Amino acid sequence: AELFLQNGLSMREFLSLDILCKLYAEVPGNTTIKPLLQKEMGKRQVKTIDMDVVGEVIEELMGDMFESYYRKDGHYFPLPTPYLDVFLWAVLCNRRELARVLWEAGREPMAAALMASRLLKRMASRAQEDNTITDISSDLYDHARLFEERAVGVLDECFNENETLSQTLLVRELDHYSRMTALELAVSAESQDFIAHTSCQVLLTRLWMGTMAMNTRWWKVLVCLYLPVLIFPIIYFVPFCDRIMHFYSAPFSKFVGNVVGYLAFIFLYAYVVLFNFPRFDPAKTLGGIHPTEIVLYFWVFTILIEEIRQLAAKPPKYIKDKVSVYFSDTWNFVDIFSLTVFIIAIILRFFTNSRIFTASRIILSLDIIFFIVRSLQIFSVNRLLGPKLVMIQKMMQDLAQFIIILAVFTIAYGIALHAVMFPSPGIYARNNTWVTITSVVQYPYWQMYGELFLDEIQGEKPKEFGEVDPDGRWLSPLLLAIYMVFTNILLLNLLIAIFNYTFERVQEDSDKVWKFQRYDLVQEYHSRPVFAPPLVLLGHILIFIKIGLSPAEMEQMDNWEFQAAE
Amino acid sequence: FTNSRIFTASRIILSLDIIFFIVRSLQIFSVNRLLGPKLVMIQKMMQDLAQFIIILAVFTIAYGIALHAVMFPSPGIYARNNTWVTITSVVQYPYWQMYGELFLDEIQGEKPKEFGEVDPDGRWLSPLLLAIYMVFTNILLLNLLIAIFNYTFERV
Amino acid sequence: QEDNTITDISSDLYDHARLFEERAVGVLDECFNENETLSQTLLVRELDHYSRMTALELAVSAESQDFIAHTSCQVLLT
């Protein structure tokens, strides 16, 4: 194929629509793409293959509201991109050297390599999670890593001459890739080697220090954030109210504003739940509500209008697609959960019942935890702290996996221990279903942390624990001996070993995963209102009341990118 | 100065400054091939602890705000009518629970004299919150910090 | 590494610094393999073209642990 392309043949004259549909027709059978295409043709009841089925497979196999160009262009119902779609065919078929040749022969190469990496590793996940598809997943991850390092090398050769061209090449509209950039193609692909490259990181620093000097510290931004008249001496700009609006346009300034006003919010929420959250009564003024709780209502309404703004400012047009893009990160799950739990608590605020207000204060006092879980994204600005947060997230995945084994042994020993201490048809009966079930759950759990109930389970302390059966009084130390040698020593250190394996896997790439989540931090603070940190709701009022280039400039971009690829 | 508070501050400051003289003593152990590298390990692990302490304090103060807010509702009969014991309880009780000193008799409403009258709906919720805090902090966060220390140990 | 206005080429710079570390260690080793007393008196010279500081002081400014852990520097420190 390479020899044909470099002796007498061009893809522009060779490939047509029927050759391409036939090329997707005689895929061999040991691939992932034949089960995917036959599953999609089973969903449409069409016996022949066309490019709309291939396009829908590519759209569900890229994700993130990707729109494949076979569905929108009339040439797929000469061809515009013959190198690109024969390349995509060779990538879907898991053909190493053929996709290499078609990548080397085609235009927009790092975008092609990042799309190939996303497509191959999402085929790897698809073959791993489906039993009707042959698990060739390690081959697909190796091929995706091969396109990862090809994209990183093309970016590196672009970076070794005229870095400004690299920064403006990473943010191009790519009309043959559903109008998304190389940054967005890389973070869809989770290509951590591409984002941790120096070009993407200085670009995220330019976007992060938006029209402002790249080494201005956080305390200068802090003292200029609440004193705008002091912006003019010390804030250095990379080129009047132009300097003011360019100071507040920085996502780092919006970040420091979110940090300081959020610490004010957490201190206010803590003052409410720890010092003043009274029972509602219509007798005294304002219902008895302290105005710190009113300012609390104001700032959580501000966070709610903030999340409604983030839902409305999503790049798709349909509201369901905006919701699907909005819930693509877990931070929006934490946001919607904390806001909904707050709104439930403040609905239950006003009912004057003792149980309903008790539920309200309990729900609010447990929702401070979820606001501080939302606070955890702030620590991703630090090279040292953010990887530890990624460690915490993957260890919580490990804990949610191990917790069924831990609960199985815990409930087994709890059933045994409570059955030998408290025989229920006897004088030693706990005549209460709830304290029996919570004892089975509770007592092995606290014994698991070395809080040994040795006085309790041997028959002493009969008032606050219970009258233990006298033959449970000698058997309970033996059962607790087996449980301590099996659970505190073996099971817990097994879980610690799982956590340490997770620690080593993240710590060997901690720098690169911080570089990758730095993109998510920049995108989190790039779309915030350009406004005062106590007045961001006024900013949402004043909202209520990725670059494109010239076509000859785009062809010049493509020529420079293709020769750096050469 | 013969004042009771000023002399108390003097003896407290002297009795805490013996610690810093013995921190200065730590350079003597660099004459040993075996001990001095362990002191370099202690120094880099204290750097690691000073980095991890903001994450540990964030989760500690979160659970402390939650725990003290469910045990002691401040506009109620179960109010701790003292700002200082509230703030030091939020700092203090998750910290000692983090080392397995579980205040299970205290947070379930028993020992009302030296701990405080716990609200009866905090008496069942405090073991659940402490369960989540023990499975998240003594198991996950502390062994994460131990893993950081072990990575530092291997590097040195 | 600590400045954002400077391109982070830091790993290349640490590799180049380690390259000069092992070059210095090898020159000290070839100095040590004949007449060790000359190595000890060479490590403590006034170096007027280096602001009058020794090879020991240039190495501990550089934190060149491979140079100080060489046998010449250690018997000199003994």
Ligand SMILES: *[C@@H]1O[C@H](CO)[C@@H](O[C@@H]2O[C@H](CO)[C@@H](O)[C@H](O)[C@H]2NC(C)=O)[C@H](O)[C@H]1NC(C)=O
């Ligand atoms: C739980 O209920 C059982 C059932 O009545 C109690 O068992 C009785 O206890 C008395 C004195 O303790 C004996 O005289 C009876 O013979 C027991 N009945 C049976 C069927 O064994 C038991 O004491 C209760 N336990 C608690 C803690 O309330």
Ligand SMILES: *[C@@H]1O[C@H](CO)[C@@H](O[C@@H]2O[C@H](CO)[C@@H](O)[C@H](O)[C@H]2NC(C)=O)[C@H](O)[C@H]1NC(C)=O
């Ligand atoms: C803290 O102060 C509050 C405010 O007075 C006390 O709450 C009162 O307690 C008495 C009896 O305990 C009740 O009769 C009142 O109705 C309560 N007032 C309110 C507004 O709820 C509370 O007892 C004090 N707690 C401590 C430990 O001193």
Ligand SMILES: [Ca+2]
């Ligand atoms: Ca959000």
